[PDB]
């Protein structure tokens, strides 16, 4: 229902392409300090 | 020279485009701000497109018609007339392939008919919104 | 309008310069003479009606 | 099927195709408007300069349609002599010499 | 009779049979009152107190109050504005005009920063910027130039219910467009089926029930509100969605496509779009329109500029009852309103954004930009260290004002050919511009004359070009409703006694009530005479009501007409096309050197000059102390003296003279409001755009063939039609890369013969006559070092002359121009004058010429006749009367009957009657025709001025009677018989013409379409930039466009080589044009054309688009 | 049937002549000669671009940035966004006003691409090619010459 | 509204009857492309050339 409409809106054209880039970047969330330390040690 | 009889428009290829050009513009500059002379490898470069003045190279090595049809060894601009700046073309070597807009967007879409793809979906392909499979085994 | 125009037509002499110009074929139809003297007639709506 | 082609070309193709095995293509006369008749011409320069320049240009580029430069518009665009009036070869190539009797008189 | 007002008037006898209850208003009130409403001037304050005292509020106050307060997202602080206030202007009008500085005054605003959490007020007086100020004449002065803000007709915000028919169904489909200002629309439509579409923001319709449940109406409340409505209950069944939030989510999906919906977001966004006023504001006019159309509030003040649920549900129910075919309708809490469709062009729905509204809108958008900046910097800046000085940024506001007054289609260049054009450029309504329809978007139905234009907008005067109906002008008596509508005066009649209580109505009250006609028999008591009376109803119908239901009456005739059109005598005899032409070309006359007043005219010759501003008016009564050609010093009754400065030979905005010479003497006593000095086209107070010329109406020798006009040489000898045209040339000595140029006498190669006129330091001496191509400003620039051609080197050394590294670019006067040099105005950086960046010395030279009349200049009377002058005959070969007086011009007869403009005939006849003077010998009573003539008209003097008002003038019988007795000139000689014709003698051959010919005195102007501005030629000149075509426009040499149609015309002839020439070797063959010039000079044959530089540019562009457009040779 | 007819009108077009359909996609973009997109010094030391220089500058900027991104080593998201902008810049260069919004300049004025110079009533194809300003010409107001 | 391309047109007349003699050099890229450059005779030949 509501989640179905969410998934339907997840697949739209978005001809602006800045809105498309924003919906693309919306996929990945933030991180906090300890995982930053872990990533730095790994790299 | 006249003797014009036919004009044949046609889809140009990359090998034709980089055969038309006399150079490869690779810098987004036009004119030096202070001396008001075109930049090297820019959108107005004398080496690529021809001399701004008549029978003069960029460093002024060869300033006479006696020196014509030749290229100055240092600055690289070929010494000729100044009307060649209206005719000589350039080219840009793209680092990634791009699609022409006339054969994708103009209804009826020609890429769509050639590939049997819907434009509502072809737009999702060529603007990096959806994947396609180029080969399945 | 028709009958006013007919009365005006039968009233004028032949040497009258307005009707002399009109009847010569030089310029102008008789309706302009009818509007000059007599009756303007029926005038149209902005939509097209009368 | 459904495509529109010139009557002369249709007849010529039928004369060619009655030989080498005979089969006729069936054709029906059509009355088309002036816009579509003008746009469906043989020369791409004139049609492109008329109307709907983008689509005419792109489908002419696809078809590789070679113009032959024989109308009164494509001869105006490229600046050479038009094929009407004093431009046709019947009048453009007149040899003018003084007459024999008056050449002898001179 | 006469005028009986504006002291110092010429005694101009009037043919006005009726009375004039209301004098014409202050003609320029539409500009001045609007601007002082914007400012909040005390005169406007007391006028508003007289006419609506409850809310005396200026436009700056409104934008400031709607702006105040400004809070951050935290809500812990706020910023507010109050008390707009002006200083005096920094410079007077004339100094502003001379020194190219805009006429402005600073704006001071009291800003207050308030903190919430700790609590302080930071009050200041922030300089908001210079604000342009309108002068006394209704014009702004920007950058020295004079500009006029033209009032704009727009479509007022509100509710507009309209219907269409569907030929596929034959049903009436009704709809509404609730159009706000800067908001989002919503349309409620009834489609082909019996459902109702509620399309909100342009996107894919809606049934009502979704929107009703969105606001919070359950199905039971929808039944209760819409029970009788069959369509509404059908859509309630068709709802296919139950639950308010179930409708809200669908609305959010339809309105936010590509957004994750949440309950709070959908709950708040619908309120945001229509109820949160920051993104939705239908203005004061829109609120008044909606609550008057729907009758929601009656006595309540105008507030809450957003919508409300009551308004929306009332709109829906109004639509459904209007589809039901109801007549009236009561909404709970409001008085009932009639159910009707609304006209898109009725003046109750078409409002007028005047100059004040436009400047207020521009200030509003500038304040919006500044508010965005200020609320950005409220947060980033540290608290307890700031003040409104640090927060306010005035650059976007002044940028918005400067962008409005310069480079906007409504901030038009002031058009001064004659004072009348100055008056009529103002008081002009334009329906095109920003926020209005453009000419390509303009339909045919907007360009007509709705029957609501009567008394609010003249149906005659519109531009004849591609703007007909989009540009018109206000009526004479029109006044502007404070809400932007156009009121009109009317005389109230109660129970059949015509009172004098003049009441102003807009178009709506003109619909409700019923209107009579001024030319009706009032029996000297306010009482009508005949019961059966000419009357207008609501929808433009004309009927015969009895003389008991008439409640309102027109103030006067000529109320429907504009200012310029009211100055046409015998207008009611002219056709509307030729009247339109006469009105449009009455504003194009040029100021002559003499400017003699017309013989026959109207009452608007005097009041269109004292109001236009170009006539100096004695401010307060007194005696003249002293006069000159430069100033008038008046002695007021109480001590004070005042010096009125003139404006001698000042250039207008179109090159015409603007002389002002006094008409008072050293001992005369003047009263307040009296004309004290005539203007460009003024004569003893009243307008004079042309001259009175002796006119015959015969076709003479084919020179007056097809609108051509012949003149006497008499008009050339005595300078009757002769204008003084003043042209302005300018040149600046800027900076450059190689150095700096200098205005000097050290010019490169030119003989010292042409340096005689120049003074010691460049520019010419004052009064030195110049021809085309002469040197005006000696100015030379550096060039650098270019290697010479060898033969130039040899030729230089042969005469020993040096390289002369500098290059001359002097100010040469352009081709086809001559005349004296009046004045030289020179700026400099050394005097510390305001010059743009990188400019050292500016100088302007004013070159004037006395343009006489010639063959080709355009002449015209007041009734749409017009023509180029065919031939200037000598005085002897012109048809002269029996007394030897030659006629001055000869019009054609064949243009008169077919154009239906016989007013020029009548104006001719009365003209002669006004010149010879009449005397009605009332020995045995008064003759029958002269019974209703006013007194002191039974006799008149020679050259006595007269006046016929527009729609009550000389009757034809009265013209016959006046023409019967036209007392002789000097001998016993009645030259013009009772018929109005005379026996002309052929001045060329000698024999008298066999038939009598119409002669009279006609008033004719000189239009600003002179030959010297139009004649143009080019053999070779400048060339265009990207394409190598010749330039054009006559500003350069320029060439004529040999367009596509001429190409077809030459193809049809079979002309091949001429077409090849005109398209190859005269336009684009870059190597071929030098060849054709060489071949012509050397006498050789014209070279064969090559390929044009147009086809090659096309080829290179086609190759640039990845299209291999190759040519195969053969 | 009808879909087959419309497709074959494009498929058979590529089969009859010698055009490979590879030219539909683009690898090297040609640049119009400088004098057809001139940079002129107006009187007053100003400058006037021909409005194609900005589009070419955008294309070169995005292509060079893509080259640097790929050479350095960049994530899939950034590289794909850069490729999409390269596509949009080329699209704007060839035809403005087709996909998305018209690429605007100062004053919110749409830019003039290569298509907007061929197209239009004022484009080369219609006029400035059929009708031209001409030398050896003049104009004047006219009067009647009844003795000629 | 004057304008210039920041260039100068020389009104010189073609002198094809004699030009300074011009030598011709052949440059080659890495990928097998050949280019011919008519360099000046009394001039140095740069082995590395932008082709
Ligand atoms: Zn060099």
């Amino acid at each position: 229902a509501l989640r179905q409409a969410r998934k339907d809106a997840e697949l739209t054209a978005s001809a602006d392409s800045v809105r498309a880039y924003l919906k693309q970047i919306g996929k990945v969330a933030l991180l906090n300090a300890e995982e930053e330390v872990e990533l730095a040690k790994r790299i | 020279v006249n003797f014009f009889d036919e004009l044949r428009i046609g889809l140009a290829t990359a090998e034709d485009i980089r055969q038309w050009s006399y150079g490869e513009v690779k810098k987004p500059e036009t004119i030096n701000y202070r001396t008001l002379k075109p930049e090297k490898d820019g959108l107005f470069c004398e080496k690529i497109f021809g001399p701004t003045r008549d029978w003069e190279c960029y460093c002024g090595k060869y300033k006479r018609v006696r020196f014509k049809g030749i290229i100055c060894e240092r600055c690289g601009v070929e010494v000729t007339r100044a009307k060649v700046r209206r005719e000589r073309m350039g080219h840009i070597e793209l680092a990634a392939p791009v699609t022409h807009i006339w054969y994708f967007k103009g209804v009826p879409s020609r890429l769509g008919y050639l590939l049997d793809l819907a434009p509502k979906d072809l737009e999702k392909i060529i603007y990096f919104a959806a994947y396609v499979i180029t080969s399945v085994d | 309008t028709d009958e006013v125009g007919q009365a005006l037509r039968e009233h004028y002499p032949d040497d009258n310069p307005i009707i002399t110009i009109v009847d010569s074929g030089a310029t102008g139809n008789f309706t302009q003479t009818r509007t000059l003297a007599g009756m303007k007639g029926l005038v149209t709506n902005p939509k097209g009606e009368f | 099927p459904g495509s529109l082609i010139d009557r002369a070309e249709f007849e010529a193709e039928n004369r060619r195709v009655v030989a080498e095995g005979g089969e006729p293509a069936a054709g029906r006369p059509v009355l088309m408007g002036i816009t579509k008749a003008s746009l469906a011409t043989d020369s791409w320069l004139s049609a492109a300069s008329f109307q709907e320049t983008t689509r005419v240009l792109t489908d002419a580029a696809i078809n590789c349609r070679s113009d032959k430069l024989n109308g009164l518009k494509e001869n105006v665009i490229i600046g050479k002599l038009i094929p009407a009036g004093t431009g046709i070869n019947r009048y453009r190539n007149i040899a003018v010499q003084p007459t024999e009797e008056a050449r002898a008189a001179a | 009779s006469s005028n009986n007002s504006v002291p110092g008037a010429p005694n101009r006898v009037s043919f006005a049979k009726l009375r004039e209850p209301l004098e014409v208003p202050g003609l320029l009130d539409v500009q001045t009152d609007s601007f002082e409403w914007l400012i909040g001037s005390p005169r406007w304050r007391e006028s508003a107190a007289e006419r609506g005292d409850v809310n005396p509020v200026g436009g700056l106050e409104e934008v400031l109050y709607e702006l105040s307060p400004i809070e951050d997202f935290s809500g812990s602080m706020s910023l507010s504005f109050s008390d707009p206030r002006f200083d005096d202007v920094k410079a007077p009008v004339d100094e502003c005009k001379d020194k190219d500085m805009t006429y402005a005054a600073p704006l001071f605003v009291t800003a207050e920063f308030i903190n919430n959490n700790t609590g302080e007020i930071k009050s200041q007086t922030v300089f908001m910027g210079d604000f342009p100020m309108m002068t006394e004449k209704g014009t702004f002065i920007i950058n020295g130039t004079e500009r006029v803000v033209v009032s704009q007709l727009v479509r007022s915000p509100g509710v507009y219910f309209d219907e269409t028919i569907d030929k596929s169904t034959d049903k009436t489909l009704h709809s509404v467009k609730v159009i706000p200002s800067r908001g989002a629309w919503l349309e409620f439509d009834v489609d082909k089926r019996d459902t109702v579409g509620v399309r909100i923001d342009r996107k894919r319709r809606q049934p009502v029930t979704v929107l009703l449940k969105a606001l919070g109406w359950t199905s039971e409340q929808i039944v209760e509100r819409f029970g009788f409505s069959e369509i509404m209950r059908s859509t309630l069944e068709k709802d296919n969605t139950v639950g308010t939030d179930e409708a809200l989510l669908d609305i959010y999906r339809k309105l936010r496509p590509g957004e994750p919906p949440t309950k709070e977001s959908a709950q708040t966004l619908l309120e945001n779009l229509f109820f949160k006023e920051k993104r939705y504001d239908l203005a004061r006019v829109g609120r008044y329109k909606v609550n008057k159309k729907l009758g929601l509030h009656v006595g309540e003040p105008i507030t809450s500029s957003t919508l409300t649920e009551e308004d929306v549900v009332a709109t829906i129910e109004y639509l459904v009852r209007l589809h039901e075919g109801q007549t009236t309708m009561t909404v709970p809490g409001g008085v009932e309103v009639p159910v009707e469709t609304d006209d898109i062009d009725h003046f109750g729905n078409r409002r007028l954004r005047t100059v004040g509204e436009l400047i207020q809108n521009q200030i509003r958008v500038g304040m919006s930009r500044m508010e965005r900046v200020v609320r950005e910097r409220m947060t980033t800046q540290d608290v307890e260290a700031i003040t409104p000085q640090t927060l306010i940024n005035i650059r976007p506001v002044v940028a918005a004002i400067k962008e409005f007054f310069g480079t906007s289609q409504l901030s038009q260049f002031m058009d001064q050919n004659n004072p009348l054009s100055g008056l009529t450029h103002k008081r002009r309504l334009s329906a095109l511009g920003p926020g209005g329809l453009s000419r390509e978007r303009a339909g045919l139905e907007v360009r007509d004359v709705h029957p609501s234009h009567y008394g609010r907008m003249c149906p005659i005067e519109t531009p004849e070009g591609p703007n007909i109906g989009l540009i018109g002008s206000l009526s004479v008596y029109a006044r502007v409703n404070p809400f932007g509508f156009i009121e009109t005066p009317y005389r109230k009649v109660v129970d059949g006694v015509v009172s004098d209580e003049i009441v102003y109505l807009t178009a709506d009250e003109e619909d409700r009530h019923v209107v009579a006609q001024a030319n009706s028999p009032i029996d000297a008591d306010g009482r009508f005479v005949e019961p059966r009376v000419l009357v207008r109803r609501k929808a433009g119908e004309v009927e015969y009501v009895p003389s008991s239901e008439v409640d309102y009456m027109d103030v006067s005739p000529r109320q429907m007409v504009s200012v310029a059109t009211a100055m046409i005598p015998f207008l009611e005899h002219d056709d509307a096309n030729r009247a339109l032409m006469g009105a449009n070309m009455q504003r194009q006359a040029v100021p002559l050197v003499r400017s003699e007043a017309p013989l026959v005219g109207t009452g608007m010759e005097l009041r269109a000059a004292i109001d236009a501003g170009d006539v100096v008016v004695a401010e307060e009564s007194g005696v003249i102390e002293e006069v000159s050609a430069d100033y008038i010093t008046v002695m007021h009754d109480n001590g004070t003296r005042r010096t009125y400065r003139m404006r001698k030979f000042a250039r207008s905005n179109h090159g015409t003279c603007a002389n002002q010479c006094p008409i008072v003497d050293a001992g005369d006593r003047v009263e307040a409001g009296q004309v004290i000095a005539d203007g460009p086209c003024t004569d003893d107070g009243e307008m004079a755009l042309g001259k009175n010329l002796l006119v015959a109406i015969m076709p003479w020798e084919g020179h007056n063939y097809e609108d051509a006009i012949i003149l006497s040489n008499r008009l050339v000898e005595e300078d009757v039609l002769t204008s003084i045209h003043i042209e302005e040339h300018e040149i600046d000595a800027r900076d450059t890369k190689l150095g700096a140029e200098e205005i000097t006498r050290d010019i490169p190669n030119i003989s010292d013969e042409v340096l005689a006129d120049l003074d010691e330091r460049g520019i010419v001496r004052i009064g030195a006559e110049v021809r085309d191509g002469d040197i005006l400003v000696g100015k030379v620039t550096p060039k650098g070092e270019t290697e010479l051609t060898p033969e130039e080197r040899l030729l230089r050394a042969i005469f020993g002359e040096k390289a002369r590294e500098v290059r001359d670019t002097s100010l040469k006067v352009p081709h086809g121009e001559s005349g004296k040099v009046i004045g030289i105005r020179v700026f400099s950086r050394e005097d510390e004058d305001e010059l743009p960046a990188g400019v050292n010395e500016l100088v302007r030279v004013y070159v004037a010429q006395k343009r006489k009349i010639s063959d080709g200049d355009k002449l015209a009377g007041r009734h749409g006749n017009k023509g180029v002058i065919g031939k200037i005959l000598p005085v002897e070969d012109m048809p002269f009367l029996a007394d030897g007086t030659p006629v001055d011009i000869i019009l054609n007869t064949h243009g008169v009957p077919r154009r239906m403009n016989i007013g020029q005939i009548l104006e001719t006849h009365l003209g002669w009657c006004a010149h010879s003077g009449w005397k009605v010998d009332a020995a045995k009573g008064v003759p029958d025709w002269a019974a209703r003539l006013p007194d002191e008209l039974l006799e008149a003097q020679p050259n006595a001025i007269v006046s016929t008002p527009v729609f009550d003038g000389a009757q034809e019988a009265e013209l016959q009677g006046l023409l019967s007795c036209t007392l002789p000139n000097r001998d016993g000689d009645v030259l013009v018989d009772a018929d109005g014709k005379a026996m002309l003698f052929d001045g060329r051959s000698g024999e008298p013409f066999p038939y009598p010919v119409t002669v009279g005195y006609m008033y004719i102007m000189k239009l600003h379409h002179l030959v010297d501005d139009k004649i143009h030629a080019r053999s070779t000149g400048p060339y265009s930039m990207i394409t190598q075509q010749p330039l054009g426009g006559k500003a350069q040499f320029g060439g004529q466009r040999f367009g596509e149609m001429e190409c077809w015309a030459m193809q049809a002839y079979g002309a091949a080589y001429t077409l090849q020439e005109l398209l190859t070797i005269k336009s684009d063959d870059t190597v071929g044009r030098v060849k054709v010039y060489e071949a012509i000079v050397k006498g050789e044959n014209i070279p064969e054309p090559g390929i044009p530089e147009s086809f090659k540019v096309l080829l290179k562009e086609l190759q640039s688009l990845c299209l291999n457009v190759e040519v195969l040779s053969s | 049937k009808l879909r087959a007819l419309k497709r074959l009108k494009v498929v058979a077009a590529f089969q009859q002549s010698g055009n490979s359909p590879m030219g539909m996609v683009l690898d090297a973009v040609p640049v119009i000669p400088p004098e057809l997109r001139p940079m002129v010094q107006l009187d007053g030391g100003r400058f006037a671009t021909s409005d194609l220089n900005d589009l070419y500058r955008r294309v070169i900027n995005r292509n060079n940035r893509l080259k640097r991104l790929i050479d350095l080593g960049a994530p899939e998201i950034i590289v794909n966004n850069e490729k999409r902008m390269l596509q949009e810049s080329v699209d704007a260069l060839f035809d403005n006003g087709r996909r998305g919004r018209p690429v605007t300049g100062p004053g919110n004025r749409p830019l003039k691409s290569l298509s907007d110079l061929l197209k239009g009533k004022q484009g080369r194809f219609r006029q400035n090619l059929l009708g031209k300003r001409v030398d050896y010409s003049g104009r004047s107001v006219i009067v009647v010459g009844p003795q000629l | 509204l004057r304008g210039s391309r920041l260039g100068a047109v020389s009104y010189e007349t073609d002198r094809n009857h004699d030009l300074a003699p011009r030598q011709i050099a052949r440059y080659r890229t890495d990928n097998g492309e050949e280019f011919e450059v008519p360099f000046a005779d009394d001039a140095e030949i740069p082995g590395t050339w932008l082709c």
Side-chain angles (χ1 to χ4, degrees), chain E residues 787-835:
Chain E
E787 261 286 290
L788 330 171
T789 65
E791 323 152 335
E792 170 70 12
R793 293 172 41 189
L794 173 53
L795 212 84
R796 280 288 182 74
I798 281 196
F799 304 150
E801 204 273 303
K802 205 172 321 303
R804 288 303 284 117
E805 72 279 13
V806 296
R807 184 259 324 273
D808 163 8
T809 75
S810 46
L811 180 57
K812 290 162 292 277
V813 52
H815 83 303
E817 192 295 330
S818 147
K820 300 288 193 296
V821 174
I822 326 170
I824 83 167
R825 176 53 177 147
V826 51
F827 298 153
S828 63
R829 193 66 77 182
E830 291 70 20
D831 300 330
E832 204 179 2
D833 292 38
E834 182 85 342
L835 276 309

Side-chain angles (χ1 to χ4, degrees), chain E residues 725-771 773-961:
Chain E
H725 291 267
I726 297 169
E727 189 177 1
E728 165 184 354
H729 299 158
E730 62 215 11
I731 188 67
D732 45 348
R734 53 183 65 253
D735 284 340
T736 187
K737 168 162 292 311
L738 311 173
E741 61 273 49
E742 277 305 323
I743 295 168
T744 36
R745 286 189 77 200
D746 184 279
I747 309 120
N749 43 358
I750 43 183
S751 80
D752 265 42
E753 182 182 2
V754 299
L755 270 78
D757 52 334
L758 301 205
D759 57 36
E760 72 272 14
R761 42 90 170 184
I763 48 192
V764 306
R765 254 170 281 270
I766 292 103
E769 196 189 317
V770 297
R771 313 220 192 288
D774 262 12
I775 301 295
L776 283 179
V777 179
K779 176 248 195 68
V780 63
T781 76
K783 195 172 148 64
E785 290 91 357
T786 58
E787 261 286 290
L788 330 171
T789 65
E791 323 152 335
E792 170 70 12
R793 293 172 41 189
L794 173 53
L795 212 84
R796 280 288 182 74
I798 281 196
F799 304 150
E801 204 273 303
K802 205 172 321 303
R804 288 303 284 117
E805 72 279 13
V806 296
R807 184 259 324 273
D808 163 8
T809 75
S810 46
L811 180 57
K812 290 162 292 277
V813 52
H815 83 303
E817 192 295 330
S818 147
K820 300 288 193 296
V821 174
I822 326 170
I824 83 167
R825 176 53 177 147
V826 51
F827 298 153
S828 63
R829 193 66 77 182
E830 291 70 20
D831 300 330
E832 204 179 2
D833 292 38
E834 182 85 342
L835 276 309
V839 178
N840 306 326
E841 194 167 359
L842 190 275
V843 57
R844 299 190 292 267
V845 179
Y846 293 105
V847 180
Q849 54 182 169
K850 185 177 298 316
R851 293 204 189 181
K852 282 186 170 60
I853 210 56
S854 287
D855 46 350
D857 319 69
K858 192 169 173 174
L859 251 63
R862 280 181 290 189
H863 316 296
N865 41 51
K866 60 191 182 312
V868 284
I869 303 153
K871 175 90 173 313
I872 296 322
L873 297 165
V875 202
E876 63 267 23
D877 43 3
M878 281 216 88
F880 57 98
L881 296 157
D883 61 358
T885 300
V887 303
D888 285 332
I889 86 162
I890 303 178
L891 300 171
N892 198 358
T893 182
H894 296 104
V896 183
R898 72 179 171 90
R899 297 179 194 271
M900 271 147 26
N901 56 2
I902 57 158
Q904 63 185 346
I905 304 304
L906 296 182
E907 178 191 6
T908 299
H909 288 302
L910 214 165
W912 185 260
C913 290
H915 166 79
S916 307
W918 59 90
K919 179 172 176 63
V920 192
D921 56 343
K924 304 181 292 181
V926 181
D928 201 13
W929 52 280
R932 67 181 52 164
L933 281 183
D935 265 331
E936 44 92 36
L937 275 168
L938 311 205
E939 55 92 17
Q941 293 303 106
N943 287 322
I945 75 198
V946 304
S947 75
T948 87
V950 177
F951 279 105
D952 72 298
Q955 296 305 114
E956 51 285 30
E958 296 172 349
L959 270 178
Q960 285 186 359

Side-chain angles (χ1 to χ4, degrees), chain E residues 167-218:
Chain E
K167 291 178 284 296
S168 68
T169 323
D170 290 331
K171 283 283 156 294
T172 58
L173 319 91
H174 273 227
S175 164
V176 47
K177 296 216 298 302
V178 192
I179 43 165
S181 59
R182 60 111 168 167
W185 302 7
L186 70 185
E187 291 81 4
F188 321 139
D189 322 67
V190 176
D191 53 358
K192 194 180 294 181
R193 54 201 51 61
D194 321 68
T195 62
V196 51
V198 200
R199 171 214 322 286
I200 44 152
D201 174 4
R202 262 57 159 218
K203 284 190 176 180
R204 186 147 258 93
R205 289 260 300 192
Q206 260 322 283
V208 279
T209 61
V210 180
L211 190 46
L212 322 165
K213 291 173 171 178
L215 268 71
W217 296 78
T218 64

